[PDB]
Amino acid sequence: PLHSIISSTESVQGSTSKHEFQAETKKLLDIVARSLYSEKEVFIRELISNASDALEKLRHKLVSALPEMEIHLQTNAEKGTITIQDTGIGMTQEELVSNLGTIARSGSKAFLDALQNQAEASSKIIGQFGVGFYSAFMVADRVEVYSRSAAPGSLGYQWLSDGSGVFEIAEASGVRTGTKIIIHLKSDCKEFSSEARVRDVVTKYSNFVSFPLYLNGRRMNT
Amino acid sequence: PLHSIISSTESVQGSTSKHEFQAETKKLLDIVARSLYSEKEVFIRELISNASDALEKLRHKLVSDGQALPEMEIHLQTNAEKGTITIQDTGIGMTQEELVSNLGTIARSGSKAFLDALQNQAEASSKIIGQFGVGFYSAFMVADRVEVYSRSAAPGSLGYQWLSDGSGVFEIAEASGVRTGTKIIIHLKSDCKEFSSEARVRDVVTKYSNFVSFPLYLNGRRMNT
Ligand SMILES: Nc1ncnc2c1ncn2[C@@H]1O[C@H](COP(=O)(O)OP(=O)(O)NP(=O)(O)O)[C@@H](O)[C@H]1O
Ligand SMILES: Nc1ncnc2c1ncn2[C@@H]1O[C@H](COP(=O)(O)OP(=O)(O)NP(=O)(O)O)[C@@H](O)[C@H]1O
Ligand SMILES: [Mg+2]
Ligand SMILES: [Mg+2]
Structure with missing residues (x-):
């Protein structure tokens, strides 16, 4: 008896605002693109860790009907997609622009510095530091994010x-x-x-995921 | 969005077997029903504690054997029209033998203590029902009629x-x-x-919901972290 929250409810309303990645972000993306990094499956944990972070942030707003706090994965073989949805803190417009566009991540600063200071292949250095959200672009033609801040009226x-x-x-x-x-x-x-x-990947660490984690409606952790 | 699992999916297929309560169980029922005990709301925690126990029992069967994990939740529902309150858990359940034995006898240790204390002391049942509790039979504080469905998690049940x-x-x-x-x-x-x-029900359960070890819902609303 499966439990899914992922469905196509979203629709784009009105016009588009166009933004450029930060220069350092473009550099990081290109390095990832042309690396031969073989453990691309890392993107799944990167996104699950971010979902968990977002759900933890949501807890910080709670005081004395509690919000659903779940992480869902869904694969779609026909459309060639994998989707991760969390019911956590979400992002404002400003947050989307800044958080998904820049190199704020401390490990990514360290990554970029390691590129200058290590006599190693980029793939090894990607292994050492990770590249956070941008790991999605290891596997993606295109990435499509919907977010709504938990702040009222957002x-x-x-x-x-x-x-x-x-x-x-x-x-x-x-x-x-x-x-x-x-x-x-x-x-x-x-x-x-x-x-x-996806199951085989996530099974290795689902026990360490702090919130309920579902894969195609099936619960993966205690 | 609500989360509810409670609905009328059940129907009797089989013959009915009628059973007499054990004498001591009859006696405890008798005592509880007639008591002036006024804190009847306790039956709600009694049932939630049993739901929790059942879900904890289900854990003991789990191994890393591949598949999904079972959903482990406790649901309360009220129905003002029908004059009911329902509690459903997704835990270990009860075999036929377990229904007859578990819901039928006074194995419960605090119930033996209750009856002992009522007999060999001069405190009235009001007090010492509060002290000891009477477990599942607390339902008969508030019930004309109790209607249980159960299926054991055991394969084949x-x-x-x-x-x-x-x-x-x-x-x-x-x-x-x-x-x-x-x-x-x-x-x-x-x-x-x-x-x-x-x-x-909300005002009662809120007092202790954050001590309840599994997800707890009231009419589809989550009550605890
Ligand atoms: N699911 C999400 N919900 C809300 N915020 C998100 C989500 N995913 C990413 N973010 C935002 O994007 C930022 C960058 O994510 P990421 O590149 O993984 O770095 P990080 O999570 O900050 N640090 P690290 O612990 O090294 O992953 C996060 O700090 C969040 O602010
Ligand atoms: N929701 C349930 N699921 C499975 N078994 C149940 C359920 N409720 C009651 N039982 C069975 O009925 C028995 C009696 O319940 P109860 O009268 O509350 O005593 P107890 O739970 O054994 N001891 P206490 O900790 O004092 O409540 C339990 O031990 C279970 O075996
Ligand atoms: Mg992260
Ligand atoms: Mg009990």
């Missing part, structure tokens, strides 16, 4: 990028509070639209 | 309905459409219809 947004130069933001209706990230997989990365492949 | 009006006898019959775990439907006495009010 609007929903769509953030779009193919990971080259530019990202877009538009207002969206039908966005649940929290964040949904839809990864449109590369033609050579379709393995991550398979339930079995 | 059938579903059963257990019925009692709390006087002398209980019935059991095989039932279809029982989810693994236990649903308890309390058909409330006339002077007890307050426990079919959501606000009444």
Whole structure:
């Protein structure tokens, strides 16, 4: 008896605002693109860790009907997608622009510094530091984010990028509070639209995931 | 958005077997029913504690054996029209043998202590029901009639309905459409219809919901972290 919250409720309303990635972000993305980094499956944990962070942030707002606090994965073999949705704190428009566009992540500063100071392949250095959210672009043709801040009266947004130069933001209706990230997989990365492949990855660490984690409606952790 | 699992999926398929309560159980029922004990709301925690126990038992069966994990939740629902309050858990459930033995006897240790203390002391039942509790039979503080469905988590298990009006006898019959775990439907006495009010149940449960070890819902609303 399965438990799913992921469905196509969202629709883009009105016009698009166009944004450029920070220079350092473009550099990071290009390095990832042209690296031969083989453990691309890391993007799943990067996104689950972010979902967990967002749910933890939501707790900080609680005092004495509690909000649902869940992380959902869904694979779609036919569409070549993998989706992660959390019911956590979400992002304002300002937050989308800043958080998904810059190199604020402390590990990513360390990463970029390591590129200058280590006589190692980039793949090894990606292994050492990680690249956080941008790990999605290991596997994605295109990344499609919907987010709505848990703050009352906040609007929903769509953030779009193919990971080259530019990202877009538009207002969206039908966005649940929290964040949904839809990864449109590369033609050579379709393995991550398979339930079995994703289960095998996530099983290795689901016991360490602090919130309820579902894969295609099936509960993965205690 | 609400989260509810409680609905009328069950129906009796099997013959009815009628059972007499053990004499000591009859005696405890008798004592509790007639008591001036006024803190009747306790039955709600009694049932939630049992739901929790059942869900904890289900954990003990889990191993890292591949698949999904079972949902582990406790649900309360009130129905003001029908004069009911229902509690459903998705835990270990009860075999037929377990229904007859577990809901039928006074194995419970605090109930043996209760009866001992009532006999060999001069405190009235009011007090010492509060001290000891009377577990599952607390339901008969507030119930005209108690309606239980249960199916054991054990592979192969059938579903059963257990019925009692709390006087002398209980019935059991095989039932279809029982989810693994236990649903308890309390058909409330006339002077007890307050426990079919959501606000009444909420105000009671809020006092201890953050000590409840599993997700707890009231009419589809989450009550605890
Ligand atoms: N699911 C999400 N919900 C809300 N905020 C998000 C989500 N995913 C990413 N973010 C924002 O994007 C930022 C960057 O994410 P990420 O690149 O993983 O770095 P980080 O999580 O800050 N640090 P690290 O612990 O090294 O991953 C986060 O700090 C959040 O502010
Ligand atoms: N929801 C339930 N699911 C499974 N078994 C149940 C359920 N409720 C009651 N039982 C069984 O009925 C027995 C009696 O319950 P109860 O009268 O509360 O005593 P107890 O729970 O054993 N001891 P105490 O800790 O004092 O409540 C339990 O031990 C269970 O075996
Ligand atoms: Mg992160
Ligand atoms: Mg008990």
